[PDB]
């Protein structure tokens, strides 16, 4: 809420001082917005708790108590104020509010439509989809659970375990696969040392289906094609890329999130040999 704690007054000196200085106060009436050269601004603060009516009472008390009251304004904590001025000078008890002003009027009026358009899409995102313990919100359940082979390894080769080098339970190893050469949007080419970029190391399956014969041998299963669970993963049939090893298209859901891309092609209907 708008909590008003301030008020300022613009006053003329005493009539005796105006007479001594040599200014005719009878010509104080003017049709312009300029102020008299002898008027001065003085401000006071209100208490820690006050209301708008308290500010009005203080302003009216100031109007009654001293001569030469020209105008006053009540300043709110949000940065706005409302101006107070007599309708007819040399005649008190005609004070009213003429207008109000805030520093963000034209500022907010100019940028309203884009603000509303972005807000209308922001608010659906902020809704939580999990409970306090990170569980399902009684709906929108995924078709398959996370730890299944086709869900955990949707776009990544699975491990290969061998007993070599271990006299106990074997452990896998890390590879040198690089992700696509994707830069942050609008962030300049910022770098701390010489690094191995992803412009090189482009996969050899970039256009193998139209500038070469494709796959001719059964050796694709040794390094490119994997059998995960009840599905087949092919590393050459994933997200599309261009000649500089950066992704081409981005797919968004109805809620607006970013899809990940899948290398799974086909479902293998495995049957035990029985007869």
């Amino acid at each position: 809420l708008s909590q008003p704690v301030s008020y300022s007054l613009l006053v003329l000196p005493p009539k005796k001082e105006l007479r001594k200085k040599g200014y005719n106060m009878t010509d104080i009436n003017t049709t312009s917005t300029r102020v008299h050269p002898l008027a001065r601004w003085q401000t006071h603060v209100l208490k820690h708790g006050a209301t708008y009516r308290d500010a009005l009472d203080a302003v009216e008390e100031a109007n009654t108590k001293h001569w030469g009251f020209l105008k006053a304004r009540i300043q709110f904590s949000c940065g706005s104020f409302e101006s107070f001025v007599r309708t007819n000078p040399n005649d008190p008890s005609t004070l009213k509010g003429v207008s109000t002003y805030d520093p963000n009027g034209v500022f907010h009026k100019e940028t309203l439509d884009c603000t509303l358009k972005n807000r209308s899409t922001l608010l659906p995102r902020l809704r939580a989809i999990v409970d306090g313990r990170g569980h399902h919100l009684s709906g929108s359940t995924p078709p398959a659970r996370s730890f299944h082979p086709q869900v955990l390894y949707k776009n990544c080769p699975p491990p290969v375990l061998s007993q070599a080098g271990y006299d106990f339970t074997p452990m896998s190893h890390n590879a040198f696969l690089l992700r696509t050469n994707d830069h942050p949007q609008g962030v300049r080419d910022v770098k701390s040392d010489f690094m191995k970029g992803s412009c090189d190391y482009r996969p050899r399956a970039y256009l193998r289906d139209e500038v070469s014969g494709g796959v001719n041998s059964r050796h694709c299963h040794c390094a490119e094609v994997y059998q995960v669970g009840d599905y087949t993963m092919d590393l050459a049939r994933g997200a599309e890329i261009d000649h500089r090893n950066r992704t081409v298209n981005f797919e968004y859901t109805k809620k607006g999130t970013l899809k990940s891309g899948s290398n799974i092609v086909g479902k293998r209907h495995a049957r035990v040999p029985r007869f």
């Binding site: 313990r133 896998s172 890390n174 701390s192 040392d193 999130t257």
Partner: protein
């Protein structure tokens, strides 16, 4: 500034001997509690204060308790080389062991000894002015480590409240084993440990044996080697409190950065330049090489493979001559890899620390001397496989009531088995559900 160490049972006391050897040799306290200050530094020093207190005659005494139910290992400490270092009240020993029964430790025997332990810990905590957590060493496979460790952590959690409790824990290895009843004790321990610990670090002896064969050139390792490696890890994590550095990391930062949800507090640990002198002299050891080392599963001190899961958070501690730009280049290179995966809800995956003091070399040791090292603790969904194999072994034995009469005779209701097994089933489902992509849930 200060930290108090609690050592429980056999593994915890034996690891304690190596830890206090290291902390003495690094600070410079003699085995009889003295400091031959020979430097011309002009003003005194304070780094010891985290681990030692002075009486006023200049003897040092350490902020630790050793708790055991059998006398032999603590009497071995009492008769060893460090006899004069420890205060005799600190070394507490009972008459007879918990005989691999969690129930015997928790209900029958630990209940008598536990009040002495709390009185000693209170007497230590009163002689502090900025205590900022407890470090606890125990094994969950044995009876007294499980039962008294759980009971003591419960009492500590009631009395001290918000103070952090960080555990280094030796879990039962997936196929090397030492006792039959390990699954029951480990399940019941994990049930108590879920509510009352802030971060738990897991260790397996089978992994450290593999690491000492593979990286070091030791054909016949023994527990002193493993305990010295553990001591090096703890010294690396606590160095941020003790020496000057560019980016310090307080013990409270671990719990805030590593734990996303209150049950998901079990972390993987690894250490990079575990290396022999001949390999150390065949290779340079730059920042990027050791950063690449901490992510290989061959470097880990727990037998789990992180390639079967997704990372949620990583905490990287660098000590020695390292420059921040090299840390940034290394972490960006790790981030580039395609076989390293983070859950899509955790975009800012890393915490960094940088300390200037390089790791100390121990006269009889097997590690080389190196100018820099990095130590990692990380949270990953791959950890769910460790619980799944323990739970499968529990189901196999409990399906036939294989040993239950011992546990029921020593004071435990049979119902506690079903409760703990259902809680671990829910923990398995938590680790399954948390790893589910957001695009599938709309």
């Amino acid at each position: 500034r200060e930290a108090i160490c609690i050592h429980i049972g056999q593994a915890g006391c034996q690891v304690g001997n190596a830890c206090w050897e290291l902390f003495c040799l690094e600070h410079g306290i003699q085995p009889d509690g003295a400091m031959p200050s020979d430097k011309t530094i002009g003003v005194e020093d304070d780094a010891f204060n985290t681990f030692f207190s002075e009486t006023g005659a200049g003897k040092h005494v350490p902020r630790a308790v050793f708790l055991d139910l059998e006398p032999t290992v603590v009497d071995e400490v009492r008769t060893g080389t460090y006899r004069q270092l420890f205060h005799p009240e600190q070394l507490i020993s009972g008459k007879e062991d918990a005989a691999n029964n969690y129930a015997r430790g928790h209900y029958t025997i630990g209940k008598e000894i536990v009040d002495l332990c709390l009185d000693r810990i209170r007497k230590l905590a009163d002689n502090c002015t900025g205590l900022q957590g407890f470090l606890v060493y125990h094994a969950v496979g044995g009876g007294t480590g499980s039962g008294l460790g759980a009971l003591l952590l419960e009492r500590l959690s009631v009395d001290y409240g918000k103070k952090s409790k960080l555990g280094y824990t030796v879990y039962p290895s997936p196929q090397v084993s030492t006792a039959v009843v390990e699954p029951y004790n480990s399940v019941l321990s994990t049930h108590s440990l879920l509510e009352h610990t802030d971060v738990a670090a897991m260790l397996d002896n089978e992994a450290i044996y593999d690491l000492t064969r593979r990286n070091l050139d030791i054909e016949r390792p023994t527990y002193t080697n493993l305990n010295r490696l553990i001591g090096q890890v703890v010294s690396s994590l606590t160095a941020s409190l003790r020496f000057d550095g560019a980016l310090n990391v307080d013990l409270t930062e671990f719990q805030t950065n590593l734990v996303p949800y209150p049950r998901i507090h079990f972390v993987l640990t690894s250490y990079a330049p575990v290396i022999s002198a001949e390999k150390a002299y065949h290779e340079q050891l730059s920042v990027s090489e050791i950063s690449n080392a901490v992510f290989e599963p061959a470097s880990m001190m727990t037998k789990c493979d992180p390639r079967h899961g997704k990372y949620m958070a990583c905490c990287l501690m660098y000590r020695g001559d390292v420059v921040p730009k090299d840390v940034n280049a290394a972490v960006a290179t790790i981030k580039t890899k395609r076989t390293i995966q983070f859950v899509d809800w955790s975009p800012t995956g890393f915490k960094c620390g940088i300390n200037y003091q390089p790791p100390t070399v121990v006269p009889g040791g097997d590690l080389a001397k190196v100018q820099r090292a990095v130590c990692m603790i990380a949270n990953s969904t791959a950890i769910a496989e460790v619980f799944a194999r323990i739970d499968h072994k529990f189901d196999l034995m409990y399906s036939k009531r294989a040993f239950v009469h011992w546990y029921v005779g020593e004071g435990m209701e049979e119902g506690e088995f079903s409760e703990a097994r259902e809680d671990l089933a829910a923990l398995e489902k938590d680790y399954e559900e948390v790893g589910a992509e957001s695009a599938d849930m709309d």
